[PDB]
Amino acid sequence: DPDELARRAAQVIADRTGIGEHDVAVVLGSGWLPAVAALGSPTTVLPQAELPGFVPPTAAGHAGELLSVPIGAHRVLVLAGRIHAYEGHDLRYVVHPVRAARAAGAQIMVLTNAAGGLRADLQVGQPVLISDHLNLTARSPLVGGEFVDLTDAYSPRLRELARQSDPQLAEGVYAGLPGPHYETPAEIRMLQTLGADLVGMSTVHETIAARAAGAEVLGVSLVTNLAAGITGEPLSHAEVLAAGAASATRMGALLADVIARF
Amino acid sequence: DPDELARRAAQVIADRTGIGEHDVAVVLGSGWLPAVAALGSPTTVLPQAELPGFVPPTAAGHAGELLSVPIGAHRVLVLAGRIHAYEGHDLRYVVHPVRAARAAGAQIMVLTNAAGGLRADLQVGQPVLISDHLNLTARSPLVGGEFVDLTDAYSPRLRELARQSDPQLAEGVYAGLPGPHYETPAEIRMLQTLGADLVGMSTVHETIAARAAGAEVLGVSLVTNLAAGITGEPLSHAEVLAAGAASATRMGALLADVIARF
Amino acid sequence: DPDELARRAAQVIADRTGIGEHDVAVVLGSGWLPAVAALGSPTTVLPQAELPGFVPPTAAGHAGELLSVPIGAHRVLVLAGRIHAYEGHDLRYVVHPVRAARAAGAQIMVLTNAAGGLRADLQVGQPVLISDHLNLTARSPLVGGEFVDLTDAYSPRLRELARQSDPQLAEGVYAGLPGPHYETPAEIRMLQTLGADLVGMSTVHETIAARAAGAEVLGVSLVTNLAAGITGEPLSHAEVLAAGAASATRMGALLADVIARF
Numbered sequence: 172d173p174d175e176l177a178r179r180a181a182q183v184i185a186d187r188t189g190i191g192e193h194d195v196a197v198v199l200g201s202g203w204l205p206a207v208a209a210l211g212s213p214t215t216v217l218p219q220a221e222l223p224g225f226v227p228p229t230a231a232g233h234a235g236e237l238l239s240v241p242i243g244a245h246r247v248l249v250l251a252g253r254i255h256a257y258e259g260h261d262l263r264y265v266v267h268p269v270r271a272a273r274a275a276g277a278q279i280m281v282l283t284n285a286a287g288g289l290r291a292d293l294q295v296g297q298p299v300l301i302s303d304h305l306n307l308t309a310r311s312p313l314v315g316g317e318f319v320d321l322t323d324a325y326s327p328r329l330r331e332l333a334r335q336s337d338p339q340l341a342e343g344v345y346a347g348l349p350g351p352h353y354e355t356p357a358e359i360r361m362l363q364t365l366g367a368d369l370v371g372m373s374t375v376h377e378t379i380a381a382r383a384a385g386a387e388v389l390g391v392s393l394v395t396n397l398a399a400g401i402t403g404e405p406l407s408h409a410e411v412l413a414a415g416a417a418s419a420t421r422m423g424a425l426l427a428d429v430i431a432r433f
Numbered sequence: 434d435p436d437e438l439a440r441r442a443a444q445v446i447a448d449r450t451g452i453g454e455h456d457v458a459v460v461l462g463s464g465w466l467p468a469v470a471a472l473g474s475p476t477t478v479l480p481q482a483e484l485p486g487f488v489p490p491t492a493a494g495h496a497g498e499l500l501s502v503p504i505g506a507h508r509v510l511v512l513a514g515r516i517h518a519y520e521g522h523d524l525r526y527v528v529h530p531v532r533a534a535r536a537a538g539a540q541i542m543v544l545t546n547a548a549g550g551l552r553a554d555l556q557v558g559q560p561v562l563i564s565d566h567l568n569l570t571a572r573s574p575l576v577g578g579e580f581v582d583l584t585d586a587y588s589p590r591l592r593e594l595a596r597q598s599d600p601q602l603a604e605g606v607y608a609g610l611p612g613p614h615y616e617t618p619a620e621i622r623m624l625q626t627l628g629a630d631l632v633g634m635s636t637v638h639e640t641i642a643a644r645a646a647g648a649e650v651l652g653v654s655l656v657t658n659l660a661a662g663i664t665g666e667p668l669s670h671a672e673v674l675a676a677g678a679a680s681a682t683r684m685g686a687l688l689a690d691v692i693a694r695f
Numbered sequence: 696d697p698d699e700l701a702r703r704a705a706q707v708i709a710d711r712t713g714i715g716e717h718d719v720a721v722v723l724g725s726g727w728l729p730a731v732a733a734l735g736s737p738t739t740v741l742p743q744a745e746l747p748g749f750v751p752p753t754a755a756g757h758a759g760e761l762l763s764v765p766i767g768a769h770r771v772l773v774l775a776g777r778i779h780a781y782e783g784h785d786l787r788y789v790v791h792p793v794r795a796a797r798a799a800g801a802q803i804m805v806l807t808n809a810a811g812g813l814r815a816d817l818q819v820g821q822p823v824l825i826s827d828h829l830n831l832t833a834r835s836p837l838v839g840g841e842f843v844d845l846t847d848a849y850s851p852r853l854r855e856l857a858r859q860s861d862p863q864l865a866e867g868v869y870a871g872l873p874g875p876h877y878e879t880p881a882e883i884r885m886l887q888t889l890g891a892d893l894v895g896m897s898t899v900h901e902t903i904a905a906r907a908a909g910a911e912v913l914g915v916s917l918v919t920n921l922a923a924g925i926t927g928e929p930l931s932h933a934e935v936l937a938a939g940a941a942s943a944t945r946m947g948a949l950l951a952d953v954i955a956r957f
């Protein structure tokens with residue numbers, strides 16, 4: 172039972188952080204690990220790996236951390252590192268950190284990801300609010316008849332708040348694909364056709380789980396690269412890995428500024 | 434294997450219903466269940482849990498009811514209560530009633546479901562014949578080289594008959610997505626770009642299992658709401674649930690009227 | 696370790712063929728099996744079932760061979776037969792042959808398949824190079840975190856060399872779907888909107904795994920029919936299974952000529 176397990180993770184978070192409630196949670200995955208530092212000074216860091224339901228049984232590699240970051244009166248549960256459906260994990264493990272954070276008190280989930288830009292405009296290193304997603308994984312983390320409306324899955328209010336801190340923030344539609352391979356240029360063209368501005372390999376399940384749980388979601392993509400076939404050149408690994416890192420800098424700090432608006 | 438379990442279920446069904454052939458099956462999906470009551474004069478009802486292979490090893494709720502009913506010159510195997518793929522279940526379980534049906538004599542499977550309407554001119558509470566589908570599940574109920582052709586998977590003949598019963602019947606293309614979450618508006622715009630008129634969370638696999646097994650299929654969606662982002666206002670749990678307790682005697686009258694024409 | 700298993704496999708190839716490296720692998724599946732004898736005299740033939748990682752206990756039928764054929768400058772591993780996701784095998788097993796091939800020295804994989812033609816200039820019996828693919832399986836043979844750019848997944852250079860042998864060779868984007876059911880005509884319309892020229896039931900994962908493993912890939916579809924709804928007439932397990940076994944000599948000879956240009 173995932174809510175039951177989320178409640179244990181949440182008890183342990185409370186126990187280990189000494190903080191009984193955590194009213195915002197921020198998942199920083201690929202491309203966004205620069206963002207961690209920059210959310211602000213953690214009072215507790217712990218390994219996610221320790222936590223009930225967290226870093227998956229089968230494959231145990233080395234998860235990231237759960238930081239407890241006060242931002243004013245908001246106690247931010249920072250999830251530095253996430254697991255991905257592409258790693259083989261049953262989606263309940265994939266969304267468990269989100270569900271744990273809910274149980275730990277998160278009103279709002281800030282879900283971040285590394286994305287390829289599908290769009291004209293888009294610059295490498297550009298943060299892009301997610302206005303909506305395409306779930307192109309053919310899955311849901313919801314099992315049974317949990318029929319969650321995904322209208323305004325990425326809170327307009329939270330996009331408004333974020334633009335209060337950076338009025339020049341774009342938004343775009345994120346296509347969530349399983350990965351972990353990057354996309355073909357034909358898949359990219361397809362995704363342009365399907366209505367996506369961004370493409371990536373996470374997030375959609377987390378949002379769904381977050382929304383199912385009642386949490387408001389702020390989604391932020393970092394364009395780590397223009398998607399395949401957009402420029403005419405192959406993808407640069409160093410660019411995907413590093414070109415957005417000062418962005419993820421910038422953004423964690425911007426982050427802290429937006430959470431403070433919550 | 435699945436086919437042998439389907440024939441075992443069929444034997445138990447013939448035994449327990451006293452009916453050697455049920456030349457029609459009806460699967461009563463979300464929002465169609467109340468329609469059972471207006472179907473005719475069933476002569477056996479048995480809990481589906483009674484039947485070999487009906488209840489999956491994984492989840493256990495309260496399985497539905499299997500009704501044997503004469504309608505016109507047909508014996509109709511009515512499945513009230515179904516399992517869904519979104520409940521976690523191997524598809525062999527999701528299509529088993531259809532396979533058990535065909536093994537029990539079924540030549541025509543009447544597959545009903547609840548759909549978001551993707552054309553803003555479909556009326557909430559109006560049935561729509563499925564003229565075709567988009568299997569967006571990335572799954573098939575068929576295993577190994579079962580290379581079934583799905584041209585006219587939804588028999589034009591049956592839709593023609595259905596329309597003699599009710600010539601105000603729309604037809605349209607149904608996108609089968611896994612569920613159980615509803616679609617984002619962005620997914621809805623994609624679905625429209627993809628040529629879908631209806632969207633739901635079932636049927637596709639049963640259609641495919643039915644065509645494989647050589648049964649013809651009449652698919653009928655109840656538009657229980659306009660899909661996400663169509664209205665410019667969020668979906669409402671309040672409509673999706675009642676949308677066909679209201680259509681109930683009318684849907685069961687339609688069903689019985691169309692089956693009689695078969 | 697998939698890669699270790701590949702390695703285990705490649706040492707048998709070396710050992711049973713007596714040749715330390717096969718610089719080209721060809722995967723013959725559906726529609727291309729008859730072409731094998733026309734490729735050349737094999738210096739060795741081993742059943743696939745004898746190699747580590749290759750074929751099942753659960754479901755056992757009767758499996759392909761692996762041939763070692765010199766072709767032009769090349770020592771070619773011929774994989775006669777493949778297994779398919781639609782048979783239900785973990786993808787690690789589906790792409791093991793290619794990974795084994797790559798481990799055996801294959802830096803070029805020629806992946807052949809049978810496809811529905813969606814594009815107006817294609818005809819039944821035509822070989823079509825695969826220019827790009829749409830992976831519509833919602834799966835990936837990659838797990839965890841290799842960085843795999845699928846830009847030029849189907850090497851333009853291999854395509855241009857092939858065309859030095861038969862410049863006749865058309866090319867198209869291949870949509871790789873789960874199978875084993877064929878597509879509904881609405882699905883084919885969608886695929887066309889998605890930019891697919893060809894549709895089939897294999898290849899994409901074997902590509903990905905070849906690309907991740909550092910091989911270039913030439914894809915060859917045999918158009919074994921038009922896609923569903925193109926002719927307004929059903930589809931064929933065996934106008935598919937060989938509207939190209941009509942042309943064994945030519946298909947083997949096409950392959951041998953193309954490979955000689957590499």
Ligand SMILES: Nc1nc2c(ncn2COCCO)c(=O)[nH]1
Nearest residue numbers: 284285286287370371372373395
């Ligand atoms: N799928 C995909 N992911 C990317 C790309 N660039 C960076 N990432 C990071 O992983 C995907 C997370 O949403 C890209 O072009 N495509």
Ligand SMILES: Nc1nc2c(ncn2COCCO)c(=O)[nH]1
Nearest residue numbers: 463547548549632633634657660
């Ligand atoms: N997938 C999907 N299913 C719907 C929609 N409206 C009604 N249904 C079916 O709801 C009953 C449970 O699936 C919709 O908009 N999308």
Ligand SMILES: Nc1nc2c(ncn2COCCO)c(=O)[nH]1
Nearest residue numbers: 809810811894895896919922935
């Ligand atoms: N998916 C798909 N595969 C095809 C089609 N035609 C030939 N093939 C290849 O068939 C795979 C099973 O033989 C088609 O129209 N669709």
